[PDB]
Symmetry: D3
Subunit: 308 residues, 6 copies
């Protein structure tokens, strides 16, 4: 069509990869900063009447990456872009989605959604939202792509042992049972989730039969990595052969690398929706699968077929 | 203040009760139908400058009850209501909140939220939303009150046996562990959640140690009641002494009464956010707690203190 | 084009007929209820980029039929429908359009109009609005098609007697004189419209010369049918040969059938913008003309020519 | 309260009168033109937190008077006006409210309504809208005050003859029967409304018994005055003793004065919602009643009581 | 494409010229007044799906011309215009763009911008806005075309003397230096801008070396012409050979003609974004260049290329 | 009143100072980051019904500081804040306000303005916007306070020499002449502003008589400081006794400190709308005046008086 792909500075390596698989290149645009840390944008080609796609995760630096996106959207609308599709592989601020007990907290995921609407986004792609309801936070079509085909694919690609699937927490049990079923279920497992009272210690206790099983932990994301380490050791305590930790989004804020190299997890496998830091890059535990091909197909299919 | 309470025909018994505890009465308004089933509304008193509260669950008849509300809101705004607070104890259409696998489904919970915004709602109360993210579906303050204090209260009021707390499904595990903790945890339990392949049978298998324990099932709602029956029998199969089924919202669509009188649950206990049908009313298993007092306090506190 | 027709459950017989005359069939979509009376919708085919038309009157069950429409619109927008055209042959809630004497009434016709805007309607068709100003209630193009060509057509098709045209009330005098003129005027006639004081009786007195004339009553709609019966008898009292009652919308709420079989009207003739009940279906007085062909042409002409 | 009254240049004489009866004076504001015919506005006093009322009909010069209003509203909002109430005794562009036969005409009454919303109007007063549905064209409370009490008052004040009430056209029959009833009805009367075919002549024929009756014509407005002259002569042809022509809005565009001094109407009586031109001012037929007192009460009652 | 050009009554001579250079003619539309000075509009041809351009400056009569535009936009949207492009060569109310010292003034340029948005404008052209920031006042693409190419063109076309460029005031210094540079700069010059205190006299003093130089005054607009006369005489006082006054917009309100024929300026040269009055038309000083060709190219290029 | 002041992390020192002069303290709120650089906000006190003021410049880190503000606004609205006033002493992104030559640039100042509207800001304070038109970019009241009283105050406080006032560039000439007049004008001066062609060198040439005058440079802001250094040296080249550089906003991005310590400016004097870096803090040239008192008065006066 008049399909154009632009990329900000959040996920440039990934944006190129989606471009490669769609046999085009990234549109000409200066996206940087002024000397004072305000974002500078200039679209250096005619987008008039074009069906444009902005590939940019809203990941760390989150506000900076968000603002880049937002302001790229403004520039393209004012430049008579035919249609603007925001492709945000990792949707920043996804976790903040409610006001529990009427806490005087923002619902910042909704704020971003508004802000994107306002600036003129016509549609969004994201992979594996923290809660799918965020699709409702928008007033505009949203295709929330699952990165679990490719994970399962890899899980099979190795296979070669037992195995069973494990929810690292209370909240991922939905996500985990799905992948249990999608595999040849069995099996299942859940983690405590057990204070009170004296010592704020964790993990406490698992449920499920992990005798000599070669385990597969799975979650939507990894931040810090304390979540999954404390589940891995607890797994291993029950004779778990090998603990493989799969997830889509590799955040890895605050001391994650140290946790992972101090972890008992044999391999951690993550998708490329967030660029890996030098620390994590320099780690043998970790290996990244690409959603490039997934994302390519999805943004082509807005050619326009459906998904599937 | 200039606080006025109005009620449509969704929850009139409950609306009166909240009025009693706030030592006022329901404002004068004709809310009915024309001969052709279009809703007729007339506010038969001066609401000019008033801080008005419309107490009306959006329950079966759902669209009818929704439309009543919506049109009562329109009439009060055009009548110069100072502020309109919609108190929807049971938020109809709450379950529809996402487009899984890009199903070409509506996000009807968001549609209602929009429609309420549009017509001029300034704030909403609801009790126990199916997903709390719905608070984000609105562009306006929303106080989502938990009806679990009063449930736990009742649970204590009987006590007199073991007991442990049980999630009737995959999705309520969050809700159940909370009530487990709020009690003197222990304990926990989850239910299958186990097809494939040949026979679409359920329940399959429980996780947790229910030997001679006197159980407490808990969920946000009851619809049909197949969900909880199939968990009750499965519980009882493992020597569970007494199965008490607690939930906030008593929907009870489609053959629920028959399921409950054919159930193995010793007592089912529900809040009064939805009027009980004659069938369910005529049942010894069931007993309703009132959120009247809870709701009274919450709508007074918009006097205006916070919650707590 | 990429023209698709979908139908909810308000006017399925009529929707099929418009499809027949446009030599296509109704798109695949599940439109029903859940067990609890919330509407279920799924569009079971790709509407991406499509010019879609939702054929659905907002008639009894009015809120149910309205909500179906509204939620079908939401699902199609979120499914990237290119353009959504709501074809509402009978616009429910059309009568409520003002706040006489500052009555604290809703302007529910405007509320619906808003609600339709909000959910993403790009244009509406309706036939014979109660007041044409409703076109202003929308912020979007509205083609209000007259079903009077086809009525006059039928009136001619029989002819064979005098005849003159008669307004059944104060408010239809505009509508009636038009059809008087469109025919070979003469003639005209109006009805009381005469209380006070003691007995709330009606009709009182006619104006106009109906000696031996073979009459033609005409109105936008029929509800109850008391309106037209009391005019028919009054006509007949002045030697009117045959009273034919024509109108577009056949509402027929509350005891209409009994009124009609107890009426003195020789034939009542109505369009098919509202499905007839079993009672009315089982009546010899009545005969329905189709707007199928009218509606077909109008929705094709959004191919896109003008109207005419 | 913090009630302030401001006036533009549309109805300054009337604005003063409403101020007199509310025992306050018009706020300090420069409202004029620049040399090039763009409106200049400056609010020369603190309106911060104030409940302000802008008294300004949107009458000839219509766009000029409209723009004055609109821009006065903008200045007061940006000056932190607590609330803005637009009091538009005569709502300009009221007649244009539909797109008959899908004419490619604007619905300019709705456009004004939007434009007023946009600029931040919180409520409007108008007297006797051409169609009441315009109340729906707004998204905000609208009190459409009837100027018929004061008319009837005057009608009584003279009395002293028969009399009966007469609709000057097809469209005013609703308005006329009301005033017929409000008086000691009898009586009624309607006018042709009779082309085709050869000569575009009018009036043709009356309906009703006007033998020696002392008549009372009534309409919402007077423009040109051909409408009412041609009804007056036709009345008089049937021995009508005296024809009194009452209406709220005295537009009097295009040769109205000549028509009136060439008319057969004994007295024409109009309200002061539009300033009379020098021509009409210099005419013995005409006499104006004030809505000053009516408008005063209505804008006080937003103190805030209801109407009544 | 389906490109259509319509014109109101603000700039009909110019609209025709743009039509000539695009080898099409102005679409059929009645744009006038009713007898009472409300604008009448009817689009007398099918615009359904069309890419329409409304050529209409918002110049004196400003509100009248603005309203024409606004209501033409409403009619075309409701007539299913594919896209509406407002081409406003001279943007009325451009000067009012701020609230200096928190003056309780309107920001009427923003009000117009809103009003245009509201009514459904999809894009605007204007030539030489008073402040370019007005592009921000809109929420929609705005191409602000410079009429300085054609001015410079003419300046060269004569050449034949020195020359240097002169800012007639404090505020135009930006505009003037640009044209200085675009020429073979040198040179520059600025004007006082010098009260206090006793006598409100002006001009006071120039800065720059104008010995025997053949000058070129340049500004965005001419209103009154006192601005430029008082600069011309001051220039001439310093031996300036010939003072040529160039500007885009020829407003010429209030006694401008007298000022110009009493001026010392040898030639005044202006673009045709505003029709010249009879007075100015009858003046030898003045000569108009056309932006017809400029505007033609710009509205074609929305074919759609970029600008350049 | 119920006036509350909250502060984010952009200007905490200044926020405290405004609090001191208003004899209250900063409200309890956690404003920080999560481990992954998403902003965390919690309002830890009841704001229900409160008139709240958020004191937070949108300065470096700009997006971070902007997002803090935006999300604090969201949290307070959802917490039923009575009214939200954003006090942004330095409005980030102010410079980007147009699309010169139709550059495909964002109008990011307008984007921020939208984003603030969207999230629910009811009013803004800022000091010395780069262009005042930004007041128009908002749809809500904006008080743009001048920090020039306090500057002039200081200028007098030293006095003790000649002096005259100097515009450091083409664009500040408006700002400079004002301060010239506000002082006992004389005098004035402007700077080149003189390329082409071979060497991109600057400054080139001054206009005005600076023989032995003790100068005063003034601008809205300082970024880099190359702007003012190159004017200072050029001033000094013409025997200027002492060059004092005054401005409101002390940005000081990119090597500003080095430029200033390498400058020829005797003293630079700036307001405290942006915290000074350690580098600049450790500099003898510089001295900061407080707008604390100015801002205190302005936010009190929304008690509510006017400004003045
Ligand atoms: Mg973690
Ligand atoms: Mg169930
Ligand atoms: Mg009836
Ligand atoms: Mg007339
Ligand atoms: Mg001038
Ligand atoms: Mg600089």
């Amino acid at each position: 069509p008049d399909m154009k792909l632009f990329a900000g500075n959040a996920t440039p390596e990934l944006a190129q990869r989606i471009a490669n698989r769609l046999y085009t290149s990234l549109g000409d645009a200066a996206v940087g900063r002024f000397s004072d840390g305000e974002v500078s944008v200039q679209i250096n080609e005619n987008v008039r009447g074009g069906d444009i796609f902005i590939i940019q995760s809203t990941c760390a630096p989150t506000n900076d990456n968000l603002m880049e996106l937002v302001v790229m959207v403004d520039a393209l609308r004012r430049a008579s872009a035919g249609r603007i599709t925001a492709v945000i592989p990792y949707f920043g601020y996804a976790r903040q989605d409610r006001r529990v007990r009427s806490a005087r907290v923002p619902i910042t995921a909704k704020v971003v959604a508004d802000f994107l609407s306002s600036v003129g986004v016509d549609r969004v792609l994201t992979v594996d939202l923290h809660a799918e309801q965020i699709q409702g936070f928008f007033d505009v079509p949203v295709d929330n792509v699952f990165g679990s085909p490719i994970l399962l694919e890899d899980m099979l690609q190795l296979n070669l042992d037992n195995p069973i699937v494990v929810s690292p927490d209370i909240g991922g049990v939905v996500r985990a049972r799905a992948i249990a079923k999608l595999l040849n279920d069995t099996d299942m497992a859940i983690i405590d989730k057990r204070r009170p009272r004296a010592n704020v210690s964790q993990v406490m206790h698992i449920i499920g039969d992990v005798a000599g099983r070669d385990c597969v932990l799975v979650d939507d994301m990894i931040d810090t990595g304390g979540t999954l380490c404390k589940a891995a050791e607890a797994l291993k305590e029950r004779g778990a052969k090998r603990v493989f930790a799969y997830a889509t989004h590799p955040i890895f804020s605050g001391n994650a690398a140290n946790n992972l190299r101090n972890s008992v997890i044999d391999e951690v496998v993550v998708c490329d929706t967030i660029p890996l830091s030098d620390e994590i890059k320099s780690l043998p535990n970790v290996r990244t699968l690409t959603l490039s091909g997934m994302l390519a197909e999805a943004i082509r299919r807005i050619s326009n077929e459906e998904s599937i």
